[PDB]
RNA sequence: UAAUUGCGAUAACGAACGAGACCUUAACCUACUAAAUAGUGGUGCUAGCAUUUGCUGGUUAUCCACUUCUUAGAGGGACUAUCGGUUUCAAGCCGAUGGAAGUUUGAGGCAAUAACAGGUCUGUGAUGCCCUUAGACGUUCUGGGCCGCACGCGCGCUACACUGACGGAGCCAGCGAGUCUAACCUUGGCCGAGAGGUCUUGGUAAUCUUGUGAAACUCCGUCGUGCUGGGGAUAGAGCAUUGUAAUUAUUGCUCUUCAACGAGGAAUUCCUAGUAAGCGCAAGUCAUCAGCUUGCGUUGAUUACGUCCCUGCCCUUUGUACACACC
């Protein structure tokens, strides 16, 4: 009966399922801490929500994220969305509603795309074209 | 007479043909129907294939 | 022995084969349609038509040799194919039956306009909402032409779809 | 039979790769206390060997005069000590 | 808050930023305000983004595509020139390197340097052609600030790429030198030369 | 172009004129009353019916 | 608490393990390397040909440590890449099967990589422990 | 015995109703079973030319065939299986029996 | 890292069978510029001579150059199964032999004249100038005369 | 208003078709069943860290209300909610404390009474008509041929070099594709730098390819203000395969030789979304591989509301001496 919440960050083709528990505040992605995300530029992007919420409130919550599908950017964005929504779910279950509202307000002020899913999935291919909506040529002579 | 088909007809488009017009071009071997494309267009509604998109 | 992916297409091809053979060899006798039923060690095929007795023939020799036809064609077990005949209800509501009747009338040789009037009055007496016939080709002319006769309104959408459009 | 181009002259870079003791200590004493130091700047000004400049920078940074703050690809941020 | 102990080393600079004040490793991304009416209500001020790789619903509305932050604008402006067009992963890297060099030089605020360069090398007016019939006619007016900054950045990058065309040397150096020349006033830049001949013909026409 | 078809226009007019007292201003209960008072073959069609119904009632209230 | 490559970095970890395996010298290198291209999609053997077999061994060991049942085909697919096949567009091409098989058999013989049930190669206990030791070494040297 | 009754149909509503009557008969007979597991419906796509010859703009059509596979894990004797198959019968529904 | 000393022995110009050799560039690219030897041959001879790539061409010895020409002219002597050679199973000898700078053109033109004198279709296409290995001169490939 | 879709309507009212309408791949069905093809909390066994909460992996029945990643169903949606600005304060166009977005929610399919002497008696066994039925224009075999070059034309591919050739290393896709007189799909070893097969506890198929390890990123080095290291195109030698046959290289590979290409002059092509394009996969013909075609994956700068100059279309005015009706 220990605390456990299961959330999911979604992208165009990337799904990252997040198990949120009450632990020591260590975040694991693909069985490893996200500090080795690799590009060293996306680490700051991942930390921006954690930076704005502060390490004080995320002291005793541990998240294990398993990602699959999509690309690097898709997976990392899905990871951020999953950790954000798992954080809000943890706040709904246990933490103060005022704290949840303040974190939601800060997140919306910074970037509305952090929690809300990026559901602008691409248009399909079309006949008589190489790309989505591009034609070859109306050759005359 | 064994001299009429000395050249092999075991494989290739000579044998991979449709059962309607016996043609060897515009054939589809997908799902093992081995039918010409236009005859498939004609009979797809009764076969089961339907136009959706 | 076959994956279901090829097996479904094979079953569709067999159904198309039976329908095409029956309509080609039974055009003179007024064929309308075929339905199938599969059960263990037996396959029943039922022909929906109008002249059930005439397609039966004398002592059912027609249906016996048609069963033997389908048998030797599709290489099933001997004697496991059985066909029956049923009189279609609402006979005039199928375009195939109307087309066969108009073919019969053309073979008889009455006027095209008289036949059009007759099929219109017959379809309205049957109760169909509307109809549309098109005669395309040469008819006492050096070059071809297309003439359409329509009764009621006929939609042109797939909202009614094959469910309501009969071609 | 045709060239279809002006085909003018090029810059004709004459970057010397061999250097003497005077050139070496001149560049070694001119690279410090300078606020404009990079691979392109050194190529433009001293016209010295890039590998020699790199090894000199590595030696100078392992002893410590100018520190690198970024270890990214194809570029390192060098800042002199005060 | 208490110091959590883990095998993973949390970097000292980001730890200090979290404890005291949010900023980069050394770059302080505060004091980003600008008093120009050409930039009021058009620049993201006091809402910084540590990374300029955002996936937001911008083009759906009317002008959010023009309301996205200036660093993202620079990223997209770099994102051009055929084969180079694309690759936002390295676009953010190259804009970060440009930020690093423009902080290493001009120890004042890099965004102050960039707005100085924009307002210094932004073409002040443009002429437009009209067909009419028989002969094309010219009519000269001024432009919008967004068009100004777009044309300035485009001309600067075009001059940099044409100076590095059929060349084997890096592009960050020439981009930085073009930006600094535009900021300070040098008369040797390609974009600056085009701008000064354009203003010559403009003042001739005025 | 967002304006709908005259057939659904007449459907809405007739529904309003025949069951005006039954329906109320609130849009949700407008949908959940139209679905049970009028037989419509499309959920989208009934949504458009109820949307134009509440729009016309808002116009009636202010206009 | 706890030492693993999951916790430690990779950029300096790969070089540290390459140096450690160079010092150990228990890889049993073939000898006929530096003449093969190592992949039909590869047209150029590495510049630092004096080594790089320790690097490839560390990479394959890390791969079979993250996963648990890999194959020579998987190794070829991972170590392959795009080929600039002239004017024709690029394509994906694998590595060299014989050198892949020889390195797999050498790993099996040395015992860093063992065989696994149902068919496949798996990380071995000694390899796991020495990986953890090198991870601790780099995590203690940098910190 | 661990029998698997597998439906390999295309009629979506027919598959739903036959699965429903099978599961309701199992429930009313009060015999252990597994839930009806639906394999993802597979779409067979044929991209073919609209026109026979090479006239007009390049236009194609994508014929689609939706096939639904589903199976229920039961444990019943042969007579009970035969009675279950005989009851709630519908033409076209393709049934098959496997034993694990 | 490691350092290197530059003495006065650095030579800008060199010779190789009365052919100019470019200096102030890498050794491997120097041999690529030299006729008859490419990038893979240069890399292989660098490995055989056992010299680090970081070292420049000036910091090379006459003994090193002699060893490099030795391996260039006799690769099979170094216990090689001879599958890295351009000229294998030659008709004139039947054994693998290394091609040299001018010897590449020599062997090519002897193959050409062999085809000419046997009057093969490949040889007649080579002499005429039209593509022999299946390419089409229909559409492109005419700005070459 | 990306539709005579609509408000209002001068004689109109009232209906019909096209349109509008009809829909998943484009979600969040957290009401409910869903992979010996799933999870973590602990469940049996394990290697390493302090015997400082446990950790990743395994064979599969070794578990305990479940569906948080993927399919459904009588029934869910967002109807441009609700407000502020402009309209004899009548359709609509815009900005805003929330759901997948509030430009019609994304792209497509089915589809206007009539016409083209537009393509197919020349890949269709729909077929009268002038052609054959003892060397037949049918069929069968070998070798040629849509595979030839002084020449022009458009689709498509590779480039003009710290972005890319690169190399040694990290981590990744959704629809689908795959064996009965056939033994097919390259899963781990042997003949073997690799290419054919020798064993199939992988396949009637989410598990063997395959959770598509490729397409874009991070430590390091050369082209370092180039008559060449971008350009394996521009030639020869060899190393390899179903096929009773591949020579005018079926295709891949290992070397050796850059005769072109410095935003490219007049004309034109395609594009507001997460679109053109930076780049690779699946299927078609297949004996071999596409660059062709039908479907996805990382992201895009400054209009989308604005007119005929050329690419044009339509309506109604207007003028006819036109009806196989400007040909």
Swiss-Prot record, chain C:
Assembly: Component of the small ribosomal subunit (SSU). Mature yeast ribosomes consist of a small (40S) and a large (60S) subunit. The 40S small subunit contains 1 molecule of ribosomal RNA (18S rRNA) and 33 different proteins (encoded by 57 genes). The large 60S subunit contains 3 rRNA molecules (25S, 5.8S and 5S rRNA) and 46 different proteins (encoded by 81 genes).
Official protein name in the record: Small ribosomal subunit protein uS3
Protein keywords: Cytoplasm, Isopeptide bond, Methylation, Phosphoprotein, Ribonucleoprotein, Ribosomal protein, RNA-binding, Ubl conjugation
Annotated TM spans: none
Keyword DNA damage carried by entry: no
Gene Ontology CC: one annotated term: 90S preribosome
Stated role: Component of the ribosome, a large ribonucleoprotein complex responsible for the synthesis of proteins in the cell. The small ribosomal subunit (SSU) binds messenger RNAs (mRNAs) and translates the encoded message by selecting cognate aminoacyl-transfer RNA (tRNA) molecules. The large subunit (LSU) contains the ribosomal catalytic site termed the peptidyl transferase center (PTC), which catalyzes the formation of peptide bonds, thereby polymerizing the amino acids delivered by tRNAs into a polypeptide chain.
Disulfide bond annotation, renumbered to this chain: none
Modified residues (Omega-N-methylarginine): 143
Keyword ATP-binding: no
Name of the gene: RPS3
Cross-linked sites for Glycyl lysine isopeptide (Lys-Gly) (interchain with G-Cter in ubiquitin): 103, 129, 138, 148
Segments forming a coiled coil: none
Location of Phosphoserine modifications: 94, 126
Domain KH type-2 span(s) in chain numbering: 18-89
Positions where Phosphothreonine occurs in the chain: 41, 67
Family assignment from sequence similarity: Belongs to the universal ribosomal protein uS3 family.
Record's miscellaneous remark: Present with 146000 molecules/cell in log phase SD medium.
Compartment list: Cytoplasm
UniProtKB/Swiss-Prot annotation, chain E:
Localization: Cytoplasm
A family per Pfam: Ribosomal_S7
Gene Ontology CC annotation, any one: cytoplasm
Cross-link (Glycyl lysine isopeptide (Lys-Gly) (interchain with G-Cter in ubiquitin)): 26, 184
Predominant localisation class: cytoplasm
Highest taxon of the lineage: Eukaryota
Disulfide bonding pattern of the chain: none
Modified how: N-terminally acetylated by acetyltransferase NatA.
GO molecular function: mRNA binding; rRNA binding; structural constituent of ribosome
GO biological process entries: cytoplasmic translation; maturation of SSU-rRNA; regulation of translational fidelity; ribosomal small subunit assembly; ribosomal subunit export from nucleus; translation
Keyword terms: Acetylation, Cytoplasm, Isopeptide bond, Phosphoprotein, Ribonucleoprotein, Ribosomal protein, Ubl conjugation
Coiled coil, from the record: none
Keyword Metal-binding set for record: no
Recorded family membership: Belongs to the universal ribosomal protein uS7 family.
Quaternary state and interactors: Component of the small ribosomal subunit (SSU). Mature yeast ribosomes consist of a small (40S) and a large (60S) subunit. The 40S small subunit contains 1 molecule of ribosomal RNA (18S rRNA) and 33 different proteins (encoded by 57 genes). The large 60S subunit contains 3 rRNA molecules (25S, 5.8S and 5S rRNA) and 46 different proteins (encoded by 81 genes).
NCBIfam families assigned to the protein according to its UniProt record, in alphabetical order: PRK04027.1, uS7_euk_arch
Protein name, as recorded: Small ribosomal subunit protein uS7
UniProt organism field: Saccharomyces cerevisiae (strain ATCC 204508 / S288c) (Baker's yeast)
Encoding gene, per UniProt annotation: RPS5
Swiss-Prot record, chain H:
GO MF annotation terms: mRNA binding; structural constituent of ribosome
Keywords: Acetylation, Cytoplasm, Isopeptide bond, Ribonucleoprotein, Ribosomal protein, Ubl conjugation
Entry's Gene Ontology cellular component terms: cytoplasm; cytosol; cytosolic small ribosomal subunit
Residue(s) of cross-link: Glycyl lysine isopeptide (Lys-Gly) (interchain with G-Cter in ubiquitin): 2, 13, 82
Record flagged with keyword Hydrolase: no
Highest rank taxon of the organism: Eukaryota
Main location: cytoplasm
PTM comment: N-terminally acetylated by acetyltransferase NatA. Also partially acetylated by NatC.
Subcellular location: Cytoplasm
Biological process (GO), any one: maturation of SSU-rRNA from tricistronic rRNA transcript (SSU-rRNA, 5.8S rRNA, LSU-rRNA)
This protein's record includes keyword Thylakoid: no
Family membership: Belongs to the universal ribosomal protein uS10 family.
Binding partners and assembly: Component of the small ribosomal subunit (SSU). Mature yeast ribosomes consist of a small (40S) and a large (60S) subunit. The 40S small subunit contains 1 molecule of ribosomal RNA (18S rRNA) and 33 different proteins (encoded by 57 genes). The large 60S subunit contains 3 rRNA molecules (25S, 5.8S and 5S rRNA) and 46 different proteins (encoded by 81 genes).
Name by which UniProt lists this protein: Small ribosomal subunit protein uS10
Highest classification ranks of the organism: Eukaryota, Fungi, Dikarya, Ascomycota, Saccharomycotina
Encoding gene per record: RPS20
Swiss-Prot record, chain I:
SUPFAM superfamilies linked: S13-like H2TH domain
N-acetylserine: residues bearing it: 1
Keyword RNA-binding: yes
Entry-annotated residues carrying N6-methyllysine: 47
A Gene Ontology term for the protein's cellular component: cytoplasm
GO molecular function: rRNA binding; structural constituent of ribosome
GO biological process, one term: endonucleolytic cleavage in ITS1 to separate SSU-rRNA from 5.8S rRNA and LSU-rRNA from tricistronic rRNA transcript (SSU-rRNA, 5.8S rRNA, LSU-rRNA)
Subcellular location: Cytoplasm
PROSITE patterns: RIBOSOMAL_S13_1, RIBOSOMAL_S13_2
Leader peptide range in chain numbering: none
Covalent link Glycyl lysine isopeptide (Lys-Gly) (interchain with G-Cter in ubiquitin), residues: 35, 48, 79, 95
Keyword line: Acetylation, Cytoplasm, Isopeptide bond, Methylation, Ribonucleoprotein, Ribosomal protein, RNA-binding, rRNA-binding, Ubl conjugation
Mod. after translation: N-terminally acetylated by acetyltransferase NatA.
Family to which the UniProt record says this protein belongs: Belongs to the universal ribosomal protein uS13 family.
Additional free-text comment from the UniProt record: Present with 48100 molecules/cell in log phase SD medium. There are 2 genes for uS13 in yeast.
Database matches in PANTHER family: 30S RIBOSOMAL PROTEIN S13/40S RIBOSOMAL PROTEIN S18 (PTHR10871), SMALL RIBOSOMAL SUBUNIT PROTEIN US13 (PTHR10871:SF3)
Quaternary state and interactors: Component of the small ribosomal subunit (SSU). Mature yeast ribosomes consist of a small (40S) and a large (60S) subunit. The 40S small subunit contains 1 molecule of ribosomal RNA (18S rRNA) and 33 different proteins (encoded by 57 genes). The large 60S subunit contains 3 rRNA molecules (25S, 5.8S and 5S rRNA) and 46 different proteins (encoded by 81 genes).
Name under which the protein is recorded: Small ribosomal subunit protein uS13A
Taxon lineage: Eukaryota, Fungi, Dikarya, Ascomycota, Saccharomycotina
